[PDB]
């Protein structure tokens, strides 16, 4: 029940981007992957204990059941998992964008290297309503160069130099800028740190002359965590979202994607599956992070876990983007979104279509321009949907008794009470031919008079793809009238064309009135 529902059709007004927080990661995640082993040695066919292709994270087979949402393979939309790290690492994508908001900050008191009224001038160039992405990234370049010309901070007065990479994949803060004023209140303590370690281990006059303060990914977030929200707008981010903190731009938790995007390809070369590149990279991520969690609990060498945490730094910087290998090179996320027809060109820009064909052509003068000839052995395969009306009820009754063996017939049928479809080969046809409730749809074969797209595969210009009428002829190739061969520049020497058919009642009218 006795309850009403009222929903409207809705549109997307435009995307907006964000980096989700370190609390948003466990929000949509529902399983946790603490263990390492993919296959349990119980030796069931899908042996997955905790940290693997989990049957309530998702499903990577047509024989299993997604325990979370429901369904075998088509009903699962995928569900996220999450990891937990012992100590943070960098984000390799934000690795460039984490030093730009680091040059502007103080290295001792965590403040922006500007005066009071000067930064009050800069955001006035933000608060006017006319700001595009050109000038906003333009003036962020200009305010960053102002902060690099300011040696000593305003709160505690500690001098700062420059910070840059150390070329592994870590950054170094080139601190002390002496010209002729070596009388710094820090150098004497720096000499005091120098002097005490000259007696013990004397082999240090050479290597301590260069060694300098690093910023490991454990110090950096605890350098970011105490900065104020009153000046995050001076460095690109805005507040008022929970994810507006700069703390969330390095990895502390990482999510696990669903298994639908990384499916277990069963190549059938063995009774075992060739497991893909993502899972066999994610497996040692939790393995290395487990021995650092357990090793520091037990007590291991800090000279040992330093490279392990650097091994964990480099490994997550390859799971995402495998360009940083510096050596068969493993695939990744960024390793497929770019490139020729990896993504965005063969999956989003140019997809693959249904209801097509690709045969050779042969000329025919004796039919008119706007009519192409279609052979019948492809014409009783490529179908076109057709809603029943009181106008066309008489013809479709005679059409449905033909069946899918003679040319002017149908292949499939869908009653409006029926849910999926019904096939015409199996079951009695004449007993089904009598009812045909007028509100349903059937799929006749292609016939003379319908609307067909047709083009050459190397396309020169917009006049290489046109529409035509069809005509059914009993041979085994595509016959067109000869005078239209000059747009297609065909040569009848073994070149093959492809035809398309629209499958609405609206776009069928679209193709004639513009592309006829």
């Amino acid at each position: 029940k006795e309850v009403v529902v009222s929903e409207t059709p809705k549109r997307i007004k435009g995307l907006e981007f964000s980096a989700l927080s370190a609390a948003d990661i466990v929000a949509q995640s529902e399983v946790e992957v603490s263990t390492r082993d993919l296959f349990d040695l119980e030796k069931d066919r899908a042996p997955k204990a905790n940290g693997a292709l989990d049957p309530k994270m998702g499903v990577s087979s047509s024989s299993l059941e997604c325990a979370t949402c429901h369904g075998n393979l088509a009903s699962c939309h995928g569900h996220f998992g999450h990891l937990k790290l012992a100590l943070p690492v960098f984000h390799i994508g934000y690795f460039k964008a984490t030093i730009q908001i680091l040059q502007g900050i103080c290295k001792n008191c965590s403040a922006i290297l500007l005066s009071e009224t000067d930064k009050r001038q800069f955001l006035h160039e933000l608060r006017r309503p006319g700001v595009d992405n050109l000038r906003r990234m333009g003036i962020l370049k200009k305010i960053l160069d102002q902060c690099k010309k300011q040696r000593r901070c305003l709160h505690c007065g500690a001098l700062n130099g420059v910070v840059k990479k150390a070329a592994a994949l870590k950054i170094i803060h080139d601190t002390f800028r002496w010209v002729g004023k070596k009388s710094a209140p820090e150098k004497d303590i720096w000499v005091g740190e120098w002097k005490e370690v000259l007696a013990h281990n004397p082999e240090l006059e050479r290597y301590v002359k260069r060694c300098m303060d690093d910023l490991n990914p454990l110090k950096t977030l605890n350098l970011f965590k105490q900065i104020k929200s009153a000046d995050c707008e001076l460095l690109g981010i805005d507040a008022t979202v929970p994810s507006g903190r700069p703390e969330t731009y390095i990895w502390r938790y990482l999510p696990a994607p669903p298994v639908c995007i990384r499916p277990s390809v069963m190549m059938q070369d063995s009774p075992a599956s060739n497991e893909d590149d993502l899972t066999v990279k994610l497996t040692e991520i939790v393995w290395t992070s487990s021995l650092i969690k357990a090793g520091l609990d037990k007590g291991i060498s800090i000279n040992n876990m330093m490279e392990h945490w650097d091994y964990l730094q480099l490994t997550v910087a390859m799971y995402i983007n495998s360009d940083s290998v510096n050596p068969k090179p493993i695939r990744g996320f960024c390793q497929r979104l770019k490139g020729k027809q990896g993504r965005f060109r063969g999956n989003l820009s140019g997809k693959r279509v249904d209801f097509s064909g690709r045969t050779v052509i042969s000329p025919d003068p004796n039919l008119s321009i706007d009519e192409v000839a279609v052979p019948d052995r492809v014409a009783k395969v490529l179908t076109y949907p057709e809603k029943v009306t009181r106008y066309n009820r008489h013809k479709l009754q005679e059409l449905i008794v033909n069946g899918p063996n003679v040319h002017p017939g149908a292949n499939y049928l869908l009653k409006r009470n029926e849910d999926a479809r019904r096939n015409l080969r199996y079951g009695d046809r004449m007993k089904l031919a009598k009812n045909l409730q007028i509100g349903d749809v059937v799929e006749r074969h292609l016939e003379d008079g319908d609307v067909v797209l047709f083009n050459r595969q190397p396309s020169l210009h917009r006049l290489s793809i046109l529409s035509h009428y069809a005509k059914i002829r009993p041979w085994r190739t595509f016959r067109l009238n000869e005078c239209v061969c000059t747009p297609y520049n065909a040569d009848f020497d073994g070149d093959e064309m492809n035809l398309h058919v629209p499958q609405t009642e609206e776009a069928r009218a679209e193709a004639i009135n513009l592309m006829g």
Binding site: E505, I512, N513, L514
Partner: protein
Amino acid sequence: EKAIPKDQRATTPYMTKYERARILGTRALQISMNAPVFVDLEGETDPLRIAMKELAEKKIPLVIRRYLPDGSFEDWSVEELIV
């Protein structure tokens, strides 16, 4: 920002090429959804063919809303335009 009556009616009075590719697109599927026709059909199938026939006598019960780029309406019935 609202509908402009016949006083400031300042666009072409002509059914452009992109119009009759859309009305005939959106008339014909109503015929496939059991709408009543207005013109004297023959023994006749293919609801696109009956759609372009009905356009000859301008018996389409529709009206086109042309938007100006400033967010303004403009109305045109399908019989008001010529071709």
